Amino acid sequence: QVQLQESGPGLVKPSQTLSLTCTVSGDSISNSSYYWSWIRQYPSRRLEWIGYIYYNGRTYYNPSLNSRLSISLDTSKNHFSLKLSSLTAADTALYYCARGFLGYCAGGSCFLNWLDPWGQGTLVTVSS
Amino acid sequence: QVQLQESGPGLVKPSQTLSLTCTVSGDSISNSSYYWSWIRQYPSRRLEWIGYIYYNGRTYYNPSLNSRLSISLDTSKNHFSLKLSSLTAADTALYYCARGFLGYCAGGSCFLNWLDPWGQGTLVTVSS
Amino acid sequence: QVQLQESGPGLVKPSQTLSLTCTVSGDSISNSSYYWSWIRQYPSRRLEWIGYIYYNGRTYYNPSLNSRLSISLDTSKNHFSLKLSSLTAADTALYYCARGFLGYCAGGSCFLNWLDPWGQGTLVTVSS
Amino acid sequence: EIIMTQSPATLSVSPGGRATLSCRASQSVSNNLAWYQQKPGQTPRLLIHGASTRATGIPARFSGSGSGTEFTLTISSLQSEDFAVYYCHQYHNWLLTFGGGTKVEIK
Amino acid sequence: EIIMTQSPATLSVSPGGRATLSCRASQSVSNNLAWYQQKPGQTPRLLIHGASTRATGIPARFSGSGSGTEFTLTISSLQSEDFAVYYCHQYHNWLLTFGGGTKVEIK
Amino acid sequence: EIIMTQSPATLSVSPGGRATLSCRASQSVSNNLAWYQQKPGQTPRLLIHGASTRATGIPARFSGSGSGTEFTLTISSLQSEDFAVYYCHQYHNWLLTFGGGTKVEIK
Amino acid sequence: NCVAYSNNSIAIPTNFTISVTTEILPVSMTKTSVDCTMYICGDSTECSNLLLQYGSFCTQLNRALTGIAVEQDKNTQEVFAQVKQIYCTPPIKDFGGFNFSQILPDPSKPSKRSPIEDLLFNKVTLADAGFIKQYGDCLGDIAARDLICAQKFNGLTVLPPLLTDEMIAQYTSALLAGTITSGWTFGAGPALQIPFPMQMAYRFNGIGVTQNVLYENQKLIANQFNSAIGKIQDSLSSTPSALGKLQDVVNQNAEALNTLVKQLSSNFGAISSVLNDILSRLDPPEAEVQIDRLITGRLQSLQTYVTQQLIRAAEIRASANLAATKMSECVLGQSKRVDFCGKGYHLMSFPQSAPHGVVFLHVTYVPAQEKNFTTAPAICHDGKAHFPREGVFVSNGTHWFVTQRNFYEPQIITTDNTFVSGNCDVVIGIVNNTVYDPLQPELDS
Amino acid sequence: NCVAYSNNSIAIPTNFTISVTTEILPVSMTKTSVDCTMYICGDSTECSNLLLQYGSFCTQLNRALTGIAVEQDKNTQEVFAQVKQIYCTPPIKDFGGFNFSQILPDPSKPSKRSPIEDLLFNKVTLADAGFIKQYGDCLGDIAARDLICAQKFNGLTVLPPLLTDEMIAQYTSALLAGTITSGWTFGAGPALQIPFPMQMAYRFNGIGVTQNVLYENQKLIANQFNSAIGKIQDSLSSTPSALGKLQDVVNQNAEALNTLVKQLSSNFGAISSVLNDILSRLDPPEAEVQIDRLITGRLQSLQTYVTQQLIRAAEIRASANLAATKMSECVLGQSKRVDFCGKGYHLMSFPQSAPHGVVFLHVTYVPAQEKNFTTAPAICHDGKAHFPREGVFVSNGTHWFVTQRNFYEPQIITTDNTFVSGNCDVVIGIVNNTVYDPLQPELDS
Amino acid sequence: NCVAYSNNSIAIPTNFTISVTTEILPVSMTKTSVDCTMYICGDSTECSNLLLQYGSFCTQLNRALTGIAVEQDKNTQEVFAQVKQIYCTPPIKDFGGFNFSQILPDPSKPSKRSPIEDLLFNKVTLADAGFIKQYGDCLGDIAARDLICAQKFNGLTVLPPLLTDEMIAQYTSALLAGTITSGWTFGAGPALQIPFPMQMAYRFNGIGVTQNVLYENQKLIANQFNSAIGKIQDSLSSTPSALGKLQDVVNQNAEALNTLVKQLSSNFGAISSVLNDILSRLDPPEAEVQIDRLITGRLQSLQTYVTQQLIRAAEIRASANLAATKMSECVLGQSKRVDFCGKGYHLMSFPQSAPHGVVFLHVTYVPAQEKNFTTAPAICHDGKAHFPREGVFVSNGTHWFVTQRNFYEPQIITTDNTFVSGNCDVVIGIVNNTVYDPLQPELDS
């Protein structure tokens, strides 16, 4: 089956840019049946959805961090990336990359299905 | 309100590539109500429109320099960029970045409204 | 008329990324009448189509290497690029960049016309 | 956004007993729910998708129920390895959201 | 493109007088005009948008008029700070264009 | 994909003779064919486009014929420089494909 | 079985049968209306704003359906409201043997509805669980429920008719009473009373049969009349395919609405067929495109239904115009048009109310028991040629008689019933015979 | 107020009233046509090229509207062009008291239009500032202006009818002159002249009233006739709702065009409702998509209008077929159909021209002043039974008379007006009375 | 050429002409049907799946066309199937000079089709190389070929009628035989035989002309009758514009189908007008968008065709209802409606079969050779006023006669043909004259 592996700097200074990469093996990110999402987990067990990108490159972001965020994919290397800027101490969390299933699609829009599987998750600390 | 600040090399050799960046604060470049444009001013008080980019990334360029130009935006850092290649001595001007208001939109097209405000403007000299 | 010139590393290690660039002079890659394609030729005289990109940036790839490939264009410098990853010894070939004519277009789709002209062709060797 | 509330923040169940977990949505999420199991320090594992369609390889002891607003995950035979944090998740709306997680402690 | 011609390239007005500025389009730009003020070495400031809708914070002495092809900006009471270069600008067509600018000198 | 088969892999023609080259498609490519000439070590040169429309600057001795599935390129007067590899190419379907190439040797 | 033709034999009927033939014509259809916005955009403001960009399409469709619904009241008025005064039949049925109890209202019934209209209303039934019936449940006979009840059924609404089935039955009772008590006269003027046997006698004299035929066979004719109407009830009960034209209207309208509602389940190329999911599951910008696909499909569905109703309403209007013409000419008069008011020679007709329709019972005279007699065009008596005033010359084998065309009543050939023109040498087929002269026996004294 | 029924009393009218009832039928509608391309694509080549991809939709719609416009000339011809020769009334009005000056043309008027058609044309008015009128201004009565004038009004154009209102009035004058001077005969053959009192007498003899009734009441009948036509003018003037069927046609057509033009203001999901802005404000590639949305919406608007006109034109054609039937049967003849040519017994009708319509003035006989007399079906005199030849036996209380059905003219019961059949023991309700014999007094000398 | 009106002169026709006028009415149209899916999606599963998202549009359209096709069988049945029994004419034509060989079937012909229907079928021709004919080639008269043959012609199919042209001709032969052998009687009852001269005599007595007129002019009338029917053949042959109503139906239907098929060549805003290229040239995801544009355009084309056929079918149904009314009232009877069954006074009519239509040959009586006589409303003899029983008083210059209205047959004014009412001082225009009394010469002996 598919396997997802995160990569990125574990310690980033505040007001720097966080760059995370999730390399996908066993599937192509251009497969029409998937969307690729980022989710962060806090120590309080709280899961927050960051954003996802469709196989064709359409991105949707959480409004809580819409002005700070971008997600892109690279078909050459089969990975999708996260860039989060204006980092604060509140961004310290455990970032997961996950594969979602797209549902019914028509007229250029799609319904979502569940996330399966999740990546191993990378821990990012925002401190000086 | 919004503030726009240009940045770039003031002296670029001819036949090199000019790179200008306009960082936007107080607004998100992904706000559906705006388009972001570049205008250059010559010593003869002549203003020339270079090109603009919609909040969603649709670019329109002046045909006078269509084959030399590209404009892009970066949602992570809230700035839009200008790349002008094949520089000659005639490109020496004062480059402004401005925020325009989009008008009525329907079916994937928009009418324009006025530019307000203009950035401080950066002076670019093309010489050896 | 138009002239196409390839550029890239003639010797790339296996499992590295191949980067080829075809600079276009005499035409703009944003001209609505063209699509820009990559074709590789093997010593057995076999020609294989790799992929093409429309003037507006729509890319179509050969399914034989769909998961390894990406093609992009840069309007500032009038060139389109090829990135081929997961290189093996079977990728040793002669890579041509060619200009194709678009046919009838309607509703966001186009029929193809012939390729004319071909670039000079660059030879890429995949070995340690 | 559809705020998803999981009623018991913690749940203490004797081994071999029955565990009942509840998830409440702010507005109708229809059958578009999923239940994820996260053992300590590991990736979340999909237990249930749809309202109640059990995922492949999930023991038949895991059973999900509900529609619209009230949803219930039930564990029929608490083995020693079922100690985990269980999250409900809705994919009805774009901007998918997760519950607070129920930590199923075992006595 | 819609070439926009501003008739007086320079205009000398006594302080406290009246200044009349004209802008002519190559083809109908409708009400889609704007007037920008550029004091020496500073950013252009929007005076008028639409044909004649004065922008917020602009003194009532600035008045714009016209429709279609002929447009006129008028300054009713030339203070000392109104010395600037005034540009008309049309956003009717895509490929927005600017006039040549009228430098309003003050005697 | 539309597999394109060129029947004679090699063809030996006396100078001043006639050369006949055949190209067969897997399914109907209609008039959407082209014939390319590749002299040794050089770029392919477009000879014929459409089914039979000769390209500009191509000698009238090159003639292409066919429609649908069977296509034929014919060289009416083999000069010394016509020794090359000739490829048929179809642009009917997206995912354009090329034939195996016929090397026209000259005796 | 060809008819043997000869140039000198005529077949004359020696008997008759009175028969009654039933005719059924639709007159109206259920006054249904459909709100455009509530059908296309169910309680949805985003859909309503997108629909406003299409202009007058909703208001054009509402005018069309409202116009059809108003035509239905006009149709019923034009047919039944012809009688100007509510006449009533006498309590005693001393009509001379004629039994109208099958077509007159029953005081014993809970409604003033005749025993043939009882079978008519109990035999025309609308669809089971159809929206026409289902609407009756949420409306609960309360007019204030219309807005809420219409909201449940996707904007569909049924309007009550201006004439109820009870009022329509009352008009047919006035038409029936006027016919039995005054014949033609209540249709053309004041209701001039006339005894029914004398009225029937003038129906006979209209079709060309002398009035003495009725008065001498009055008991037999009354029995034939009564038996014929008695057969109507059995014919309607034992044959449920006799009310097919009225059921056809009801079935066509029911099938139209059912298809109109099921169109709401179609995707029409959008992402979903339910507006709530498009708005609650999708990005707010991404919803207008999907709603436009639904709006286009649902608007086209409504346009299709409206055009069909317009064409069908015209068809029913044609039938209603025919029923009004048959009311005036068959019921209020005696038609000389041959197959208009039944087959045979028209005597009279009786209107019976039916759901969205009318039933006519056409009483007609049918010749029976023909016999063939030798005939001649003229008679030679004194060198002069004698032609019948009315009727035909016939011969029973040895003697010549003059008799009426439609009944064998032989009479002695006399100057009274013949007229003289020309002489014997001109007419082809002339025969020699005696012509009686009533004055001679008086001079013979 | 029921009619009292008894088996031996008959009500016979002792008087009559002549009455005139007005009937109004539409015949045609304004010959409007709409160019598809000029409506959808106003002087625009880019829109025209995009529209060409839809095939024959424009040319199909133009054929439909042109077909409707040609039906309108056929309708007017079928109704009015029935008269083959332009007969004329005599200058002197010595018709025996009958005053036709209200329906005959006036030499004093600037047009040969009668004083009732004067009120008809002055009472049917088209919409104020309507396109039908507005088109008359840019056209300036010059045929060469049609292409430019049609360009102003978005392709809408009105075509002149083949028969002008003056020619239509001339045909009704020929129909009127033929009726007054020759009765039935100009409709079936050559115009056989007949004096009007004798013509009217045969109208009486048609409805079943003897001709001597007219000649003995000729002055009274002429007064009733004149007063009835005099009331028509007041009835039309004092009631402006009498021309509602003709206004309905004009209002429906005007409302159709107004809605068709206002559809041009709708966006139909495009970026703007004006084609010039889409082409002048937007990128040349980005314009085709917006124009397609406008083309789809405007093409659908035109299709809706055309289908409605097709259905409506069929409705007017049905009314025109009825007006032609009423012209032949009410004006050129005397109808036996009861409510066809007015209520009462039809005597004659007069056509009057009206804008896109016809008005019929139906002259009818209405019984009045009924009286009830004892009646019997037959008379016993010498053991034989006597039946009336025409009419009914009535009794004033002591003596028996035989009288006609529709008028109380009592006559002595005589062998002349009775015929004998059967004997006394068969007929039910037979009465004993004397039957006069004209031969006996001659032998009594 | 006005008619000179005077108050005391009457023009009476001294002669007549028998004339025959031809009437042509459409009855049905070719039973064509169109499969929605095979038209829109030619053997294409991807198009079929996309079309399924539009719901019931295909099945609604199939019901509409099937309903129209079934109406065509009803139309033909309602017109021709009126005759209940297949009567036959006698082999000998001893009808008294009347030659019906032009309208009766020919045993010499390969089909039992009369010499006028031979010209009718040879003059109505469908379009050359039209789909109605082209379908006949792939079908090869084999019913099993329908599915394959329909596939070739884009789903178009033509259904065979329930009554063949041979069976329709057989029904008109029964109608003709019944008319010639039994007159009115086969339409109202059993076929009572009657000699044709006597039958024709009662047609005369119907229009108001005495029967002795026929028997004294029988040879002349038969010659006029024969010559008139002889002119019909030349009139039809020498004028190919006489069958324009039947050709109009055939041309309108052919033009509808031709336009429907050519709509398949339109792009409708897609990338190509051929579904195979969209599917074989384009990316599999990129094809649904292009197919939807084709589906929308082709579905709208079919909807346009279906609505037009619905409106047109209603128009033909109206004509078929009129033909059935003319069959009953003109052929099976004698109409009193003036211009219904031809111009002039209707005597009889003959039905002739025609392709999808019927032709009526209306035999009518036309007055001729009018002469003007002085007339009076009444006669003064013994202080009493004498009125004509039937006819008019006329004066040849010195003597007064009483004569019938429609033919100049002068008779001596006698008590027999006059009745007495009132006295001389009341009637305006009364004249003094003698009234003969037949009893006086008997007493003069």
mmCIF file with all atom_site columns, N, CA, C and O in Angstrom, chain A residues 40-66:
data_model
loop_
_atom_site.group_PDB
_atom_site.id
_atom_site.type_symbol
_atom_site.label_atom_id
_atom_site.label_alt_id
_atom_site.label_comp_id
_atom_site.label_asym_id
_atom_site.label_entity_id
_atom_site.label_seq_id
_atom_site.pdbx_PDB_ins_code
_atom_site.Cartn_x
_atom_site.Cartn_y
_atom_site.Cartn_z
_atom_site.occupancy
_atom_site.B_iso_or_equiv
_atom_site.pdbx_formal_charge
_atom_site.auth_seq_id
_atom_site.auth_comp_id
_atom_site.auth_asym_id
_atom_site.auth_atom_id
_atom_site.pdbx_PDB_model_num
ATOM 1   N N  . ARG A 1 40 ? -2.185 19.027 12.239  1.00 0.00 ? 40 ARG A N  1
ATOM 2   C CA . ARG A 1 40 ? -1.277 19.152 13.371  1.00 0.00 ? 40 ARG A CA 1
ATOM 3   C C  . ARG A 1 40 ? -1.974 18.783 14.669  1.00 0.00 ? 40 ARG A C  1
ATOM 4   O O  . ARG A 1 40 ? -3.153 19.079 14.860  1.00 0.00 ? 40 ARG A O  1
ATOM 5   N N  . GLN A 1 41 ? -1.236 18.122 15.553  1.00 0.00 ? 41 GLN A N  1
ATOM 6   C CA . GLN A 1 41 ? -1.737 17.672 16.842  1.00 0.00 ? 41 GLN A CA 1
ATOM 7   C C  . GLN A 1 41 ? -0.996 18.350 17.982  1.00 0.00 ? 41 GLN A C  1
ATOM 8   O O  . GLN A 1 41 ? 0.235  18.323 18.028  1.00 0.00 ? 41 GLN A O  1
ATOM 9   N N  . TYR A 1 42 ? -1.739 18.919 18.901  1.00 0.00 ? 42 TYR A N  1
ATOM 10  C CA . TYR A 1 42 ? -1.193 19.613 20.054  1.00 0.00 ? 42 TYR A CA 1
ATOM 11  C C  . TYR A 1 42 ? -1.053 18.672 21.240  1.00 0.00 ? 42 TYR A C  1
ATOM 12  O O  . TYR A 1 42 ? -1.614 17.578 21.246  1.00 0.00 ? 42 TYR A O  1
ATOM 13  N N  . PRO A 1 43 ? -0.281 19.054 22.259  1.00 0.00 ? 43 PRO A N  1
ATOM 14  C CA . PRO A 1 43 ? -0.178 18.202 23.453  1.00 0.00 ? 43 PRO A CA 1
ATOM 15  C C  . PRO A 1 43 ? -1.493 17.967 24.164  1.00 0.00 ? 43 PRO A C  1
ATOM 16  O O  . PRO A 1 43 ? -1.607 16.984 24.903  1.00 0.00 ? 43 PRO A O  1
ATOM 17  N N  . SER A 1 44 ? -2.485 18.833 23.984  1.00 0.00 ? 44 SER A N  1
ATOM 18  C CA . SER A 1 44 ? -3.804 18.664 24.581  1.00 0.00 ? 44 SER A CA 1
ATOM 19  C C  . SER A 1 44 ? -4.689 17.696 23.809  1.00 0.00 ? 44 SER A C  1
ATOM 20  O O  . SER A 1 44 ? -5.911 17.734 23.971  1.00 0.00 ? 44 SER A O  1
ATOM 21  N N  . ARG A 1 45 ? -4.089 16.853 22.972  1.00 0.00 ? 45 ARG A N  1
ATOM 22  C CA . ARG A 1 45 ? -4.744 15.889 22.091  1.00 0.00 ? 45 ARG A CA 1
ATOM 23  C C  . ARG A 1 45 ? -5.602 16.550 21.032  1.00 0.00 ? 45 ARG A C  1
ATOM 24  O O  . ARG A 1 45 ? -6.332 15.858 20.321  1.00 0.00 ? 45 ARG A O  1
ATOM 25  N N  . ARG A 1 46 ? -5.533 17.863 20.890  1.00 0.00 ? 46 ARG A N  1
ATOM 26  C CA . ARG A 1 46 ? -6.383 18.547 19.934  1.00 0.00 ? 46 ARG A CA 1
ATOM 27  C C  . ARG A 1 46 ? -5.795 18.430 18.541  1.00 0.00 ? 46 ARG A C  1
ATOM 28  O O  . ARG A 1 46 ? -4.629 18.762 18.321  1.00 0.00 ? 46 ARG A O  1
ATOM 29  N N  . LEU A 1 47 ? -6.603 17.957 17.600  1.00 0.00 ? 47 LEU A N  1
ATOM 30  C CA . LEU A 1 47 ? -6.213 17.852 16.204  1.00 0.00 ? 47 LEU A CA 1
ATOM 31  C C  . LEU A 1 47 ? -6.781 19.033 15.436  1.00 0.00 ? 47 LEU A C  1
ATOM 32  O O  . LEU A 1 47 ? -7.969 19.338 15.550  1.00 0.00 ? 47 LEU A O  1
ATOM 33  N N  . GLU A 1 48 ? -5.933 19.703 14.672  1.00 0.00 ? 48 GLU A N  1
ATOM 34  C CA . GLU A 1 48 ? -6.344 20.831 13.855  1.00 0.00 ? 48 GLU A CA 1
ATOM 35  C C  . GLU A 1 48 ? -5.980 20.580 12.404  1.00 0.00 ? 48 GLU A C  1
ATOM 36  O O  . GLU A 1 48 ? -4.837 20.244 12.098  1.00 0.00 ? 48 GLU A O  1
ATOM 37  N N  . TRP A 1 49 ? -6.951 20.729 11.523  1.00 0.00 ? 49 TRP A N  1
ATOM 38  C CA . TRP A 1 49 ? -6.712 20.585 10.101  1.00 0.00 ? 49 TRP A CA 1
ATOM 39  C C  . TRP A 1 49 ? -6.065 21.845 9.557   1.00 0.00 ? 49 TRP A C  1
ATOM 40  O O  . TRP A 1 49 ? -6.556 22.950 9.786   1.00 0.00 ? 49 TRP A O  1
ATOM 41  N N  . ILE A 1 50 ? -4.962 21.685 8.838   1.00 0.00 ? 50 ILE A N  1
ATOM 42  C CA . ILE A 1 50 ? -4.236 22.820 8.283   1.00 0.00 ? 50 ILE A CA 1
ATOM 43  C C  . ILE A 1 50 ? -4.677 23.123 6.861   1.00 0.00 ? 50 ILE A C  1
ATOM 44  O O  . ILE A 1 50 ? -5.039 24.253 6.540   1.00 0.00 ? 50 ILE A O  1
ATOM 45  N N  . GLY A 1 51 ? -4.665 22.128 5.989   1.00 0.00 ? 51 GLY A N  1
ATOM 46  C CA . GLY A 1 51 ? -5.099 22.318 4.623   1.00 0.00 ? 51 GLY A CA 1
ATOM 47  C C  . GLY A 1 51 ? -4.843 21.089 3.784   1.00 0.00 ? 51 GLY A C  1
ATOM 48  O O  . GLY A 1 51 ? -4.062 20.230 4.182   1.00 0.00 ? 51 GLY A O  1
ATOM 49  N N  . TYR A 1 52 ? -5.500 20.977 2.635   1.00 0.00 ? 52 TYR A N  1
ATOM 50  C CA . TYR A 1 52 ? -5.260 19.865 1.732   1.00 0.00 ? 52 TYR A CA 1
ATOM 51  C C  . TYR A 1 52 ? -5.145 20.373 0.308   1.00 0.00 ? 52 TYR A C  1
ATOM 52  O O  . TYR A 1 52 ? -5.559 21.485 -0.012  1.00 0.00 ? 52 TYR A O  1
ATOM 53  N N  . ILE A 1 53 ? -4.542 19.548 -0.536  1.00 0.00 ? 53 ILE A N  1
ATOM 54  C CA . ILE A 1 53 ? -4.366 19.845 -1.949  1.00 0.00 ? 53 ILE A CA 1
ATOM 55  C C  . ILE A 1 53 ? -4.897 18.667 -2.752  1.00 0.00 ? 53 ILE A C  1
ATOM 56  O O  . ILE A 1 53 ? -4.636 17.510 -2.419  1.00 0.00 ? 53 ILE A O  1
ATOM 57  N N  . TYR A 1 54 ? -5.681 18.962 -3.778  1.00 0.00 ? 54 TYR A N  1
ATOM 58  C CA . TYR A 1 54 ? -6.182 17.941 -4.677  1.00 0.00 ? 54 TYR A CA 1
ATOM 59  C C  . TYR A 1 54 ? -5.074 17.435 -5.583  1.00 0.00 ? 54 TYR A C  1
ATOM 60  O O  . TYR A 1 54 ? -4.022 18.053 -5.728  1.00 0.00 ? 54 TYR A O  1
ATOM 61  N N  . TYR A 1 55 ? -5.319 16.271 -6.181  1.00 0.00 ? 55 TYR A N  1
ATOM 62  C CA . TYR A 1 55 ? -4.376 15.711 -7.139  1.00 0.00 ? 55 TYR A CA 1
ATOM 63  C C  . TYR A 1 55 ? -4.061 16.678 -8.272  1.00 0.00 ? 55 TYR A C  1
ATOM 64  O O  . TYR A 1 55 ? -2.965 16.627 -8.839  1.00 0.00 ? 55 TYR A O  1
ATOM 65  N N  . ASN A 1 56 ? -4.998 17.550 -8.628  1.00 0.00 ? 56 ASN A N  1
ATOM 66  C CA . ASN A 1 56 ? -4.780 18.498 -9.709  1.00 0.00 ? 56 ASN A CA 1
ATOM 67  C C  . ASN A 1 56 ? -4.240 19.838 -9.235  1.00 0.00 ? 56 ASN A C  1
ATOM 68  O O  . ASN A 1 56 ? -4.094 20.748 -10.054 1.00 0.00 ? 56 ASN A O  1
ATOM 69  N N  . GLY A 1 57 ? -3.944 19.992 -7.952  1.00 0.00 ? 57 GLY A N  1
ATOM 70  C CA . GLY A 1 57 ? -3.342 21.210 -7.463  1.00 0.00 ? 57 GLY A CA 1
ATOM 71  C C  . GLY A 1 57 ? -4.265 22.241 -6.858  1.00 0.00 ? 57 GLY A C  1
ATOM 72  O O  . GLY A 1 57 ? -3.813 23.359 -6.598  1.00 0.00 ? 57 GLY A O  1
ATOM 73  N N  . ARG A 1 58 ? -5.538 21.927 -6.652  1.00 0.00 ? 58 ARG A N  1
ATOM 74  C CA . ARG A 1 58 ? -6.450 22.863 -6.005  1.00 0.00 ? 58 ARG A CA 1
ATOM 75  C C  . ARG A 1 58 ? -6.274 22.786 -4.495  1.00 0.00 ? 58 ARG A C  1
ATOM 76  O O  . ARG A 1 58 ? -6.386 21.705 -3.912  1.00 0.00 ? 58 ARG A O  1
ATOM 77  N N  . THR A 1 59 ? -6.002 23.919 -3.859  1.00 0.00 ? 59 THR A N  1
ATOM 78  C CA . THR A 1 59 ? -5.683 23.957 -2.440  1.00 0.00 ? 59 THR A CA 1
ATOM 79  C C  . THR A 1 59 ? -6.816 24.600 -1.659  1.00 0.00 ? 59 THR A C  1
ATOM 80  O O  . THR A 1 59 ? -7.428 25.568 -2.115  1.00 0.00 ? 59 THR A O  1
ATOM 81  N N  . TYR A 1 60 ? -7.078 24.059 -0.474  1.00 0.00 ? 60 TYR A N  1
ATOM 82  C CA . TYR A 1 60 ? -8.039 24.595 0.474   1.00 0.00 ? 60 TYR A CA 1
ATOM 83  C C  . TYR A 1 60 ? -7.364 24.662 1.830   1.00 0.00 ? 60 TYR A C  1
ATOM 84  O O  . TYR A 1 60 ? -6.745 23.687 2.257   1.00 0.00 ? 60 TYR A O  1
ATOM 85  N N  . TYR A 1 61 ? -7.473 25.803 2.500   1.00 0.00 ? 61 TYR A N  1
ATOM 86  C CA . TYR A 1 61 ? -6.760 26.058 3.741   1.00 0.00 ? 61 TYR A CA 1
ATOM 87  C C  . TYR A 1 61 ? -7.732 26.364 4.869   1.00 0.00 ? 61 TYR A C  1
ATOM 88  O O  . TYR A 1 61 ? -8.851 26.821 4.639   1.00 0.00 ? 61 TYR A O  1
ATOM 89  N N  . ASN A 1 62 ? -7.293 26.105 6.083   1.00 0.00 ? 62 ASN A N  1
ATOM 90  C CA . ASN A 1 62 ? -8.084 26.458 7.250   1.00 0.00 ? 62 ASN A CA 1
ATOM 91  C C  . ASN A 1 62 ? -8.079 27.971 7.414   1.00 0.00 ? 62 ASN A C  1
ATOM 92  O O  . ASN A 1 62 ? -7.008 28.583 7.408   1.00 0.00 ? 62 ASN A O  1
ATOM 93  N N  . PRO A 1 63 ? -9.241 28.613 7.545   1.00 0.00 ? 63 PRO A N  1
ATOM 94  C CA . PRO A 1 63 ? -9.260 30.072 7.721   1.00 0.00 ? 63 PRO A CA 1
ATOM 95  C C  . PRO A 1 63 ? -8.515 30.563 8.944   1.00 0.00 ? 63 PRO A C  1
ATOM 96  O O  . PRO A 1 63 ? -8.143 31.738 8.986   1.00 0.00 ? 63 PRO A O  1
ATOM 97  N N  . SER A 1 64 ? -8.298 29.714 9.948   1.00 0.00 ? 64 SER A N  1
ATOM 98  C CA . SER A 1 64 ? -7.568 30.143 11.134  1.00 0.00 ? 64 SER A CA 1
ATOM 99  C C  . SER A 1 64 ? -6.134 30.530 10.812  1.00 0.00 ? 64 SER A C  1
ATOM 100 O O  . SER A 1 64 ? -5.530 31.309 11.555  1.00 0.00 ? 64 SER A O  1
ATOM 101 N N  . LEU A 1 65 ? -5.578 30.004 9.726   1.00 0.00 ? 65 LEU A N  1
ATOM 102 C CA . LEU A 1 65 ? -4.209 30.291 9.325   1.00 0.00 ? 65 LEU A CA 1
ATOM 103 C C  . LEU A 1 65 ? -4.108 30.468 7.817   1.00 0.00 ? 65 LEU A C  1
ATOM 104 O O  . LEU A 1 65 ? -3.092 30.121 7.211   1.00 0.00 ? 65 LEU A O  1
ATOM 105 N N  . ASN A 1 66 ? -5.157 31.009 7.201   1.00 0.00 ? 66 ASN A N  1
ATOM 106 C CA . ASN A 1 66 ? -5.204 31.146 5.749   1.00 0.00 ? 66 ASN A CA 1
ATOM 107 C C  . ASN A 1 66 ? -4.149 32.112 5.218   1.00 0.00 ? 66 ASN A C  1
ATOM 108 O O  . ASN A 1 66 ? -3.562 31.870 4.159   1.00 0.00 ? 66 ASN A O  1
#
